A paper describes a structure:
HIT is caused by antibodies to complexes that form between platelet factor 4 (PF4) released from activated platelets and heparin or cellular glycosaminoglycans (GAGs). Here we describe and compare the crystal structures of PF4 in complex with Fabs derived from KKO and RTO and the structure of PF4 in complex with a heparin-mimic pentasaccharide, fondaparinux. NMR studies reveal that PF4 exists as an equilibrium among monomers, dimers and tetramers. Each monomer contains three-stranded antiparallel β-sheets on which an aperiodic N-terminal domain and an amphipathic C-terminal α-helix are folded.
In prior studies, we identified a murine monoclonal antibody (KKO) to PF4/heparin complexes that causes heparin-induced thrombosis and thrombocytopenia in a murine model, thus sharing salient features with the clinical disorder. Human HIT antibodies compete with KKO for binding to PF4/heparin, and KKO augments formation of pathogenic immune complexes.
Numbering used by the authors:
A (entry chain B): 1 to 214
B (entry chain C): 1 to 218
The structure:
């Protein structure tokens, strides 16, 4: 019955700055509060115990505070490796309950996407399949549009577009765009193009190949 | 890894699932074992706890009726069984622990087991190499990749050169197309290394117990 409320689903900051994650308990929980860090594709890592004590091994820039019902995780010197979800937990009374989490994102300068295009593999072809792939790498901000054109006509059906989590090293994003086709349709047309339009250019970033060649 | 959790599993609707969690060293009985659930939209939810010393348990009342927690001290293993599964039970399940004396909070978390409740069949991934071709050299760097297509359920882990190249790696989350998942992975290497310094992607799909390695051909 004790609810831990993390009212901020999202927090933003810049490298070097501070960030403050808040957690509101519905009843008093003294200082029986723990904080956890969860990086993408990792299990949670225990950060703070007893509201304010840091685990052996944890950087000094993580500070927890509070008592009763209001609890705070402060990260004073945010590095790019600090991208993660952070969540509180109470172990004052049963059942153990957790807040719903706050995800940190980092601000950085705008940056343009590097584009690579890949024709269907031979293995895929002998299997009866045809996918064409474009990687748009290391851009910022997140927002980006990709268009596929086959011999100059837009194709929308069959396109899967997927963003990575924010990059732990440079705070950029990357994106994969896959155009899925039948083998027969693929072997009938020639010119395959992905066009990425991103804020950092009024002109589309383009990569293309011809099947009849390459 | 102190807490070794069983692999991702597909479970049919209404059947049971039994997960395992193996503890390391000679420290099994120094801890309470806890199970925690995460449905990728929601938050963490505490399921239950067990005492390995005698087998005593405690539960979140929400989960108690369909959950059985046991232990094997001889093999130092904790087990959680859940019965009558629905789609709402599809989630990742963590094995965790905290000191037997005081509840620090959870000091170590296992890697977690993604359980998918679905009537569908298990389908292993086809792995396709993404080698650089007609594309321009892209400067002094070359980006390679692997397309992982037609698998069910989640998830897959893609690694490059058996764990080696793991700073230049981008991992794209899987999407559904025709009931099946597709994801991709890319790695960037200096272009001067390409032909002879070979590059291989290794794709594990726990749920179908399949591992496919694919050498990228020059
Ligand atoms: Zn990167
Ligand atoms: Zn055509």
């Amino acid at each position: 019955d004790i609810q831990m409320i993390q009212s901020q689903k999202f927090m933003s900051t810049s490298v070097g700055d501070r960030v403050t994650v808040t957690c509101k308990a519905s009843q008093n929980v003294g200082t029986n509060v723990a904080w956890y860090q969860q990086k993408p594709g990792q299990s949670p890592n225990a950060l703070i115990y007893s509201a304010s004590y840091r685990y052996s091994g944890v950087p000094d820039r993580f500070t927890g505070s509070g008592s009763g019902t209001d609890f705070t995780l402060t990260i004073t010197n945010v590095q790019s490796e600090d991208l993660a979800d952070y969540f509180c937990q109470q172990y004052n009374s049963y059942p153990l309950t957790f807040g719903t989490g706050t995800k940190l994102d980092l601000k950085r300068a705008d940056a343009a996407p590097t584009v690579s295009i890949f024709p269907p593999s031979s293995e895929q072809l002998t299997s009866g399949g045809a996918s064409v792939v474009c990687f748009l790498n290391n851009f910022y901000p997140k927002d980006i549009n990709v268009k596929w054109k086959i011999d100059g006509s837009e194709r929308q059906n069959g396109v899967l577009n997927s963003w990575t989590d924010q990059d732990s090293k440079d705070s950029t994003y990357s994106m994969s765009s896959t155009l899925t086709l039948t083998k027969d349709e693929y072997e009938r047309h020639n010119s395959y193009t992905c066009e990425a339009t991103h804020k950092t250019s009024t002109s589309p970033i383009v990569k293309s190949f011809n099947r009849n060649e390459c | 890894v102190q807490l070794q959790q069983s692999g991702a599993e597909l479970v049919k609707p209404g059947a049971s699932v039994k997960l395992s969690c193996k503890a390391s060293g000679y420290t099994f009985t120094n801890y309470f074992i806890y199970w925690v659930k995460q449905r990728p939209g929601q938050g963490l939810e505490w399921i239950g706890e067990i005492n390995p010393r005698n087998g005593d348990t405690d539960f979140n009342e929400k989960f108690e009726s369909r959950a059985t927690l046991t232990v094997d001290k001889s093999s130092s293993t904790a087990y959680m069984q859940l019965s009558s599964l629905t789609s709402e039970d599809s989630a990742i399940y963590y094995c965790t622990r905290s000191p037997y004396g005081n509840n620090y909070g959870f000091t170590y978390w296992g890697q977690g087991t993604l359980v998918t409740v679905s009537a569908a069949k298990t389908t292993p991934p086809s792995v396709y190499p993404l080698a650089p071709g007609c594309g321009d050299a892209a400067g002094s760097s070359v980006t390679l990749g692997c397309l992982v297509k037609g698998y069910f359920p989640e998830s897959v882990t893609v690694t490059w050169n058996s764990g080696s190249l793991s700073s230049s790696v981008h991992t794209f989350p899987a999407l559904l197309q025709s009931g099946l998942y597709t994801m991709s992975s890319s790695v960037t290497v200096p272009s001067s290394t390409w032909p002879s310094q070979t590059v291989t992607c290794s794709v594990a799909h726990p749920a179908s117990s399949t591992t496919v390695d694919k050498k990228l051909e020059p």
